[PDB]
Protein backbone atom coordinates (compact mmCIF):
# COMPACT_ATOMS: atom_id res chain seq x y z
CA UNK A 1 0.00 0.00 0.00
CA UNK A 2 1.12 3.59 0.62
CA UNK A 3 1.16 5.65 3.80
CA UNK A 4 -0.52 9.06 3.60
CA UNK A 5 0.17 10.94 6.81
CA UNK A 6 -1.52 14.29 7.24
CA UNK A 7 -1.13 16.63 10.21
CA UNK A 8 -2.93 19.96 10.57
CA UNK A 9 -1.63 22.61 12.93
CA UNK A 10 -3.21 25.86 13.99
CA UNK A 11 -1.55 27.91 11.24
CA UNK A 12 -0.13 25.23 8.91
CA UNK A 13 -0.88 21.88 7.27
CA UNK A 14 1.82 19.26 6.62
CA UNK A 15 1.13 16.30 4.34
CA UNK A 16 3.36 13.24 4.10
CA UNK A 17 3.34 10.47 1.53
CA UNK A 18 5.25 7.57 0.01
CA UNK A 19 7.46 7.96 -3.03
CA UNK A 20 7.27 4.30 -4.07
CA UNK A 21 5.33 3.19 -7.14
CA UNK A 22 4.20 -0.40 -6.85
CA UNK A 23 3.32 -1.78 -10.28
CA UNK A 24 3.77 -5.55 -10.65
CA UNK A 25 3.63 -6.02 -6.85
CA UNK A 26 6.82 -8.11 -6.58
CA UNK A 27 9.02 -5.15 -7.53
CA UNK A 28 9.17 -1.35 -7.32
CA UNK A 29 8.99 0.24 -10.76
CA UNK A 30 10.12 3.76 -9.98
CA UNK A 31 11.24 5.70 -6.94
CA UNK A 32 10.34 9.37 -6.28
CA UNK A 33 6.79 9.13 -7.61
CA UNK A 34 4.18 11.91 -7.91
CA UNK A 35 1.19 11.46 -5.57
CA UNK A 36 0.45 15.09 -4.77
CA UNK A 37 -1.82 16.92 -7.19
CA UNK A 38 -1.02 20.56 -6.46
CA UNK A 39 -3.92 22.89 -7.17
CA UNK A 40 -3.21 26.52 -8.05
CA UNK A 41 -5.40 27.87 -5.25
CA UNK A 42 -3.23 26.76 -2.28
CA UNK A 43 -4.99 23.38 -2.00
CA UNK A 44 -2.46 20.56 -2.08
CA UNK A 45 -4.46 17.38 -2.66
CA UNK A 46 -2.85 14.05 -1.83
CA UNK A 47 -4.19 10.77 -3.22
CA UNK A 48 -3.36 7.15 -2.55
CA UNK A 49 -4.26 3.72 -3.86
CA UNK A 50 -3.77 2.09 -7.24
CA UNK A 51 -1.64 4.08 -9.68
CA UNK A 52 -4.22 3.64 -12.42
CA UNK A 53 -7.07 5.19 -10.44
CA UNK A 54 -5.07 7.91 -8.68
CA UNK A 55 -4.01 9.34 -12.06
CA UNK A 56 -7.44 9.18 -13.67
CA UNK A 57 -8.97 10.93 -10.66
CA UNK A 58 -6.26 13.35 -9.60
CA UNK A 59 -6.13 14.79 -13.09
CA UNK A 60 -9.92 14.96 -13.45
CA UNK A 61 -10.29 16.67 -10.09
CA UNK A 62 -7.50 19.12 -10.89
CA UNK A 63 -8.78 20.31 -14.27
CA UNK A 64 -12.32 20.51 -12.93
CA UNK A 65 -11.13 22.82 -10.15
CA UNK A 66 -8.77 24.78 -12.39
CA UNK A 67 -11.74 25.36 -14.68
CA UNK A 68 -13.78 26.82 -11.83
CA UNK A 69 -10.82 28.94 -10.78
CA UNK A 70 -10.59 30.28 -14.34
CA UNK A 71 -14.29 30.60 -15.20
CA UNK A 72 -14.45 33.01 -12.28
CA UNK A 73 -11.65 35.32 -11.22
CA UNK A 74 -11.81 33.94 -7.67
CA UNK A 75 -10.26 30.82 -6.17
CA UNK A 76 -12.02 27.79 -4.75
CA UNK A 77 -12.60 27.58 -1.02
CA UNK A 78 -11.04 24.61 0.73
CA UNK A 79 -14.41 23.68 2.22
CA UNK A 80 -16.02 23.78 -1.20
CA UNK A 81 -13.10 21.95 -2.79
CA UNK A 82 -13.21 19.19 -0.18
CA UNK A 83 -16.89 18.56 -0.75
CA UNK A 84 -16.60 18.85 -4.51
CA UNK A 85 -14.16 15.97 -4.77
CA UNK A 86 -16.28 14.03 -2.28
CA UNK A 87 -19.23 14.34 -4.63
CA UNK A 88 -17.17 13.08 -7.55
CA UNK A 89 -16.14 9.98 -5.61
CA UNK A 90 -19.74 9.19 -4.69
CA UNK A 91 -20.78 9.86 -8.27
CA UNK A 92 -18.00 7.67 -9.63
CA UNK A 93 -18.76 4.82 -7.24
CA UNK A 94 -21.80 3.25 -8.88
CA UNK A 95 -20.22 3.11 -12.35
CA UNK A 96 -16.48 2.85 -11.70
CA UNK A 97 -14.91 1.59 -8.47
CA UNK A 98 -12.04 4.14 -8.03
CA UNK A 99 -10.17 2.51 -5.15
CA UNK A 100 -8.52 5.75 -4.04
CA UNK A 101 -8.00 7.50 -0.71
CA UNK A 102 -7.49 11.25 -0.68
CA UNK A 103 -6.29 13.71 1.97
CA UNK A 104 -7.78 17.08 1.10
CA UNK A 105 -5.73 19.94 2.50
CA UNK A 106 -5.53 23.64 1.80
CA UNK A 107 -6.04 27.13 3.14
CA UNK A 108 -8.83 29.70 3.20
CA UNK A 109 -8.85 33.33 4.25
CA UNK A 110 -12.02 32.77 6.30
CA UNK A 111 -11.55 29.37 7.97
CA UNK A 112 -7.80 29.01 8.47
CA UNK A 113 -5.73 26.04 7.40
CA UNK A 114 -8.07 23.08 6.97
CA UNK A 115 -7.47 19.39 6.33
CA UNK A 116 -9.99 16.74 5.37
CA UNK A 117 -9.95 12.95 5.13
CA UNK A 118 -11.67 10.47 2.81
CA UNK A 119 -11.79 6.70 2.26
CA UNK A 120 -12.55 4.16 -0.50
CA UNK A 121 -16.11 5.46 -0.43
CA UNK A 122 -16.98 9.10 0.20
CA UNK A 123 -16.25 9.63 3.90
CA UNK A 124 -15.26 13.31 4.08
CA UNK A 125 -14.76 14.76 7.57
CA UNK A 126 -12.62 17.64 8.79
CA UNK A 127 -9.90 16.43 11.15
CA UNK A 128 -6.73 17.73 12.77
CA UNK A 129 -4.75 14.60 11.90
CA UNK A 130 -5.27 11.52 9.79
CA UNK A 131 -3.68 8.69 7.88
CA UNK A 132 -4.34 6.25 5.07
CA UNK A 133 -3.10 3.00 3.63
CA UNK A 134 -1.85 -0.01 5.52
CA UNK A 135 0.64 2.14 7.39
CA UNK A 136 -2.15 4.05 9.09
CA UNK A 137 -2.22 1.48 11.88
CA UNK A 138 1.32 2.48 12.90
CA UNK A 139 1.20 6.26 12.44
CA UNK A 140 -2.25 7.22 13.73
CA UNK A 141 -1.10 6.51 17.28
CA UNK A 142 2.07 8.63 17.16
CA UNK A 143 0.11 11.70 16.06
CA UNK A 144 -2.23 11.37 19.04
CA UNK A 145 0.62 11.22 21.55
CA UNK A 146 2.26 14.29 20.05
CA UNK A 147 -0.58 16.65 19.20
CA UNK A 148 0.12 19.45 21.66
CA UNK A 149 -2.23 22.36 21.00
CA UNK A 150 -0.95 25.45 19.16
CA UNK A 151 1.78 23.56 17.34
CA UNK A 152 4.45 24.95 15.04
CA UNK A 153 6.08 23.76 11.82
CA UNK A 154 9.49 23.01 13.39
CA UNK A 155 7.81 20.76 15.96
CA UNK A 156 5.48 19.07 13.48
CA UNK A 157 8.38 17.94 11.31
CA UNK A 158 9.93 16.49 14.46
CA UNK A 159 6.80 14.38 14.83
CA UNK A 160 7.21 13.05 11.30
CA UNK A 161 10.86 12.23 11.96
CA UNK A 162 9.54 10.35 15.00
CA UNK A 163 6.99 8.75 12.65
CA UNK A 164 8.99 7.91 9.53
CA UNK A 165 11.56 6.09 11.65
CA UNK A 166 8.73 4.00 13.08
CA UNK A 167 7.60 2.80 9.65
CA UNK A 168 11.19 1.91 8.83
CA UNK A 169 11.38 -0.30 11.94
CA UNK A 170 8.10 -2.15 12.52
CA UNK A 171 6.18 -2.14 9.23
CA UNK A 172 5.92 -4.86 6.56
CA UNK A 173 7.28 -2.99 3.55
CA UNK A 174 9.82 -0.69 5.19
CA UNK A 175 9.52 2.69 3.53
CA UNK A 176 12.63 4.86 3.54
CA UNK A 177 11.90 7.82 1.27
CA UNK A 178 9.12 10.32 1.93
CA UNK A 179 7.77 13.57 0.49
CA UNK A 180 6.49 16.41 2.66
CA UNK A 181 4.25 19.32 1.68
CA UNK A 182 4.65 22.09 4.23
CA UNK A 183 2.06 24.83 3.80
CA UNK A 184 3.28 27.48 6.23
CA UNK A 185 2.34 31.14 5.60
CA UNK A 186 1.06 30.77 2.00
CA UNK A 187 4.30 29.07 0.89
CA UNK A 188 3.80 25.48 -0.24
CA UNK A 189 7.27 23.92 -0.32
CA UNK A 190 8.24 20.33 -1.10
CA UNK A 191 10.72 19.04 1.49
CA UNK A 192 11.20 15.40 0.54
CA UNK A 193 13.26 13.52 3.12
CA UNK A 194 14.67 10.02 3.40
CA UNK A 195 15.04 7.43 6.20
Amino acid sequence: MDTLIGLRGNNFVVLAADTYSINSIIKLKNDDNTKFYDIHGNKCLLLGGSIGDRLQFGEFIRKNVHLYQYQNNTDMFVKSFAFFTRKNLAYYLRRNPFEVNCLIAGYDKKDGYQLYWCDYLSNMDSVNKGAHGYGAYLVSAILDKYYHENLTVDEALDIFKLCFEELKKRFLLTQINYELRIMYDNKVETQYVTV
Binding site: N72, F77, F83, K87
Partner: protein, 241 residues
Protein backbone atom coordinates in the same frame (compact mmCIF):
# COMPACT_ATOMS: atom_id res chain seq x y z
CA UNK B 1 -43.94 24.46 -44.53
CA UNK B 2 -41.26 27.06 -43.81
CA UNK B 3 -43.22 30.12 -44.95
CA UNK B 4 -44.48 30.73 -41.39
CA UNK B 5 -40.95 31.16 -40.02
CA UNK B 6 -40.57 34.49 -38.26
CA UNK B 7 -36.75 34.01 -38.14
CA UNK B 8 -36.28 34.99 -34.50
CA UNK B 9 -32.57 34.03 -34.54
CA UNK B 10 -31.57 35.90 -37.71
CA UNK B 11 -29.41 39.02 -37.91
CA UNK B 12 -30.46 42.34 -39.46
CA UNK B 13 -28.66 44.26 -42.23
CA UNK B 14 -27.52 46.81 -39.62
CA UNK B 15 -25.77 44.11 -37.55
CA UNK B 16 -28.24 44.13 -34.65
CA UNK B 17 -30.89 41.53 -33.82
CA UNK B 18 -34.60 42.26 -34.32
CA UNK B 19 -36.08 40.09 -31.56
CA UNK B 20 -33.57 41.31 -28.98
CA UNK B 21 -34.25 45.01 -29.54
CA UNK B 22 -38.00 44.34 -29.74
CA UNK B 23 -37.98 42.69 -26.33
CA UNK B 24 -35.59 45.35 -25.02
CA UNK B 25 -38.12 48.07 -25.72
CA UNK B 26 -40.89 45.76 -24.50
CA UNK B 27 -39.47 45.86 -20.98
CA UNK B 28 -39.03 49.63 -21.21
CA UNK B 29 -42.82 50.01 -20.98
CA UNK B 30 -43.16 47.83 -17.87
CA UNK B 31 -42.81 48.82 -14.22
CA UNK B 32 -39.68 50.48 -12.81
CA UNK B 33 -37.42 48.74 -10.29
CA UNK B 34 -34.78 50.58 -8.28
CA UNK B 35 -31.42 49.09 -7.35
CA UNK B 36 -29.23 50.50 -4.63
CA UNK B 37 -26.09 49.45 -2.74
CA UNK B 38 -25.36 50.91 0.69
CA UNK B 39 -22.69 50.24 3.30
CA UNK B 40 -25.10 48.29 5.49
CA UNK B 41 -26.65 46.31 2.65
CA UNK B 42 -28.27 46.26 -0.76
CA UNK B 43 -31.79 47.68 -1.28
CA UNK B 44 -34.06 46.85 -4.21
CA UNK B 45 -36.96 49.07 -5.22
CA UNK B 46 -40.06 48.21 -7.18
CA UNK B 47 -43.26 49.77 -8.47
CA UNK B 48 -46.52 47.85 -8.28
CA UNK B 49 -48.44 48.54 -11.47
CA UNK B 50 -52.08 49.39 -10.83
CA UNK B 51 -54.70 46.98 -12.14
CA UNK B 52 -57.61 47.56 -9.72
CA UNK B 53 -58.18 48.04 -6.01
CA UNK B 54 -59.15 44.38 -5.62
CA UNK B 55 -55.55 43.17 -5.39
CA UNK B 56 -54.45 41.98 -1.93
CA UNK B 57 -51.40 44.33 -1.80
CA UNK B 58 -50.68 43.20 1.78
CA UNK B 59 -49.35 39.62 1.71
CA UNK B 60 -47.42 39.43 -1.55
CA UNK B 61 -46.22 41.34 -4.60
CA UNK B 62 -45.09 40.19 -8.05
CA UNK B 63 -41.97 42.36 -8.37
CA UNK B 64 -39.24 41.36 -5.89
CA UNK B 65 -38.57 37.63 -5.58
CA UNK B 66 -36.18 35.54 -3.52
CA UNK B 67 -33.66 33.20 -5.13
CA UNK B 68 -31.89 32.00 -2.00
CA UNK B 69 -31.18 33.17 1.53
CA UNK B 70 -28.60 35.63 0.16
CA UNK B 71 -29.70 36.50 -3.42
CA UNK B 72 -32.83 38.40 -4.41
CA UNK B 73 -33.93 40.09 -7.62
CA UNK B 74 -36.54 42.55 -8.81
CA UNK B 75 -38.32 41.65 -12.04
CA UNK B 76 -38.68 44.52 -14.53
CA UNK B 77 -40.43 43.36 -17.69
CA UNK B 78 -42.79 40.64 -18.85
CA UNK B 79 -43.99 38.85 -15.73
CA UNK B 80 -44.77 35.68 -17.68
CA UNK B 81 -41.21 35.12 -18.90
CA UNK B 82 -39.81 35.97 -15.48
CA UNK B 83 -41.35 33.14 -13.43
CA UNK B 84 -39.65 30.61 -15.68
CA UNK B 85 -36.35 32.39 -15.10
CA UNK B 86 -36.79 32.68 -11.33
CA UNK B 87 -37.55 28.97 -11.21
CA UNK B 88 -34.43 28.45 -13.30
CA UNK B 89 -32.44 30.70 -10.99
CA UNK B 90 -33.51 28.96 -7.79
CA UNK B 91 -32.43 25.64 -9.29
CA UNK B 92 -29.01 27.04 -10.15
CA UNK B 93 -28.80 28.54 -6.68
CA UNK B 94 -29.36 25.12 -5.14
CA UNK B 95 -27.39 23.09 -7.67
CA UNK B 96 -24.25 24.92 -6.57
CA UNK B 97 -24.94 24.19 -2.91
CA UNK B 98 -25.54 20.53 -3.67
CA UNK B 99 -22.39 20.29 -5.79
CA UNK B 100 -20.04 22.37 -3.63
CA UNK B 101 -21.51 22.57 -0.06
CA UNK B 102 -21.17 26.36 -0.08
CA UNK B 103 -23.39 29.32 -0.88
CA UNK B 104 -23.30 30.42 -4.47
CA UNK B 105 -21.78 33.86 -5.03
CA UNK B 106 -24.06 36.30 -6.81
CA UNK B 107 -21.39 36.90 -9.47
CA UNK B 108 -21.78 33.29 -10.60
CA UNK B 109 -25.57 32.99 -10.59
CA UNK B 110 -25.86 35.83 -13.10
CA UNK B 111 -23.57 33.97 -15.49
CA UNK B 112 -25.58 30.81 -14.90
CA UNK B 113 -28.80 32.63 -15.80
CA UNK B 114 -27.62 35.03 -18.53
CA UNK B 115 -26.43 32.00 -20.49
CA UNK B 116 -30.02 30.77 -20.51
CA UNK B 117 -31.12 34.09 -21.99
CA UNK B 118 -28.21 34.10 -24.44
CA UNK B 119 -28.95 30.55 -25.59
CA UNK B 120 -32.45 31.50 -26.72
CA UNK B 121 -31.05 34.12 -29.09
CA UNK B 122 -28.43 31.64 -30.32
CA UNK B 123 -30.29 28.55 -31.50
CA UNK B 124 -33.55 26.68 -31.11
CA UNK B 125 -35.53 29.21 -33.09
CA UNK B 126 -37.68 30.58 -30.26
CA UNK B 127 -38.47 34.08 -29.05
CA UNK B 128 -36.13 35.60 -26.45
CA UNK B 129 -37.02 36.16 -22.82
CA UNK B 130 -38.56 39.60 -22.56
CA UNK B 131 -37.29 40.37 -19.06
CA UNK B 132 -34.28 41.86 -17.29
CA UNK B 133 -33.97 42.10 -13.52
CA UNK B 134 -31.80 43.72 -10.86
CA UNK B 135 -30.34 40.59 -9.33
CA UNK B 136 -28.23 41.41 -6.31
CA UNK B 137 -26.95 39.71 -3.23
CA UNK B 138 -24.18 39.29 -0.71
CA UNK B 139 -21.16 36.98 -0.99
CA UNK B 140 -18.28 36.18 1.33
CA UNK B 141 -15.57 37.16 -1.16
CA UNK B 142 -16.60 40.64 -2.27
CA UNK B 143 -19.41 41.89 -0.03
CA UNK B 144 -22.69 43.24 -1.33
CA UNK B 145 -23.23 43.32 -5.08
CA UNK B 146 -25.91 44.22 -7.59
CA UNK B 147 -26.09 43.05 -11.20
CA UNK B 148 -28.40 44.04 -14.04
CA UNK B 149 -29.11 41.50 -16.78
CA UNK B 150 -30.66 42.11 -20.20
CA UNK B 151 -32.82 40.15 -22.67
CA UNK B 152 -29.69 39.57 -24.77
CA UNK B 153 -27.56 38.43 -21.83
CA UNK B 154 -24.87 41.13 -21.44
CA UNK B 155 -25.05 41.70 -17.71
CA UNK B 156 -23.07 44.29 -15.78
CA UNK B 157 -22.18 45.04 -12.18
CA UNK B 158 -23.63 48.20 -10.69
CA UNK B 159 -24.18 50.39 -7.63
CA UNK B 160 -27.48 52.12 -8.44
CA UNK B 161 -29.68 51.27 -11.41
CA UNK B 162 -33.31 52.07 -12.12
CA UNK B 163 -34.37 50.03 -15.17
CA UNK B 164 -37.94 49.71 -16.45
CA UNK B 165 -39.87 52.80 -17.53
CA UNK B 166 -38.60 56.40 -17.32
CA UNK B 167 -35.03 55.23 -16.73
CA UNK B 168 -33.53 58.49 -18.02
CA UNK B 169 -35.11 60.63 -15.32
CA UNK B 170 -34.63 57.91 -12.72
CA UNK B 171 -30.91 57.45 -13.36
CA UNK B 172 -30.37 61.21 -13.12
CA UNK B 173 -31.50 61.15 -9.49
CA UNK B 174 -29.15 58.33 -8.52
CA UNK B 175 -26.25 59.86 -10.46
CA UNK B 176 -26.10 62.93 -8.21
CA UNK B 177 -27.71 61.93 -4.92
CA UNK B 178 -26.06 58.53 -4.31
CA UNK B 179 -23.15 59.05 -1.95
CA UNK B 180 -20.11 56.79 -1.98
CA UNK B 181 -21.01 55.37 1.45
CA UNK B 182 -24.59 55.48 2.73
CA UNK B 183 -26.18 53.89 5.76
CA UNK B 184 -29.33 51.76 5.67
CA UNK B 185 -31.75 54.44 6.89
CA UNK B 186 -30.40 57.16 4.59
CA UNK B 187 -30.19 54.72 1.69
CA UNK B 188 -33.82 53.65 2.05
CA UNK B 189 -35.01 57.22 1.60
CA UNK B 190 -32.78 57.60 -1.46
CA UNK B 191 -34.53 54.74 -3.25
CA UNK B 192 -37.83 56.28 -2.19
CA UNK B 193 -36.81 59.71 -3.49
CA UNK B 194 -35.82 58.50 -6.95
CA UNK B 195 -39.04 56.49 -7.16
CA UNK B 196 -41.44 59.33 -6.41
CA UNK B 197 -39.76 61.48 -9.06
CA UNK B 198 -40.06 58.64 -11.58
CA UNK B 199 -43.87 58.32 -11.68
CA UNK B 200 -44.23 62.15 -11.88
CA UNK B 201 -45.50 62.39 -8.29
CA UNK B 202 -44.32 63.98 -5.06
CA UNK B 203 -44.92 61.29 -2.39
CA UNK B 204 -45.95 57.61 -2.75
CA UNK B 205 -49.54 56.48 -2.25
CA UNK B 206 -48.52 53.75 0.31
CA UNK B 207 -50.44 51.17 -1.81
CA UNK B 208 -47.67 51.40 -4.34
CA UNK B 209 -43.94 50.59 -4.46
CA UNK B 210 -42.39 47.82 -2.35
CA UNK B 211 -38.83 47.54 -1.08
CA UNK B 212 -36.51 44.92 0.41
CA UNK B 213 -33.03 44.81 1.88
CA UNK B 214 -30.33 42.28 2.78
CA UNK B 215 -27.99 43.83 5.44
CA UNK B 216 -26.00 40.74 6.37
CA UNK B 217 -25.67 40.54 10.16
CA UNK B 218 -23.34 37.54 9.64
CA UNK B 219 -26.42 35.48 8.77
CA UNK B 220 -28.08 37.22 5.74
CA UNK B 221 -31.41 38.07 7.39
CA UNK B 222 -33.07 39.35 4.13
CA UNK B 223 -36.02 41.26 5.59
CA UNK B 224 -38.79 42.37 3.23
CA UNK B 225 -41.42 45.06 3.91
CA UNK B 226 -45.07 45.33 4.86
CA UNK B 227 -47.65 47.99 4.07
CA UNK B 228 -47.27 49.42 7.59
CA UNK B 229 -43.47 49.56 7.59
CA UNK B 230 -43.60 51.67 4.42
CA UNK B 231 -45.61 54.30 6.33
CA UNK B 232 -42.60 55.06 8.52
CA UNK B 233 -40.44 55.43 5.42
CA UNK B 234 -42.99 57.72 3.77
CA UNK B 235 -43.08 59.94 6.87
CA UNK B 236 -39.30 60.37 6.85
CA UNK B 237 -39.46 61.22 3.14
CA UNK B 238 -42.11 63.92 3.64
CA UNK B 239 -40.19 65.52 6.53
CA UNK B 240 -36.98 66.70 4.86
CA UNK B 241 -36.24 64.85 1.59
Amino acid sequence: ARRYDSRTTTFSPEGRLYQVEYALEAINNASITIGLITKDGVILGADKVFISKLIDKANNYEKIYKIDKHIFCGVAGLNADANILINQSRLYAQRYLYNYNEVQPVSQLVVQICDIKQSYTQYGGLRPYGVSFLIGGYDTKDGYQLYHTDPSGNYSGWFATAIGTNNLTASSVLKQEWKNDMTLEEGLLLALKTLAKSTDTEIPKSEKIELAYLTNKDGEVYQKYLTEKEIEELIKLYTQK
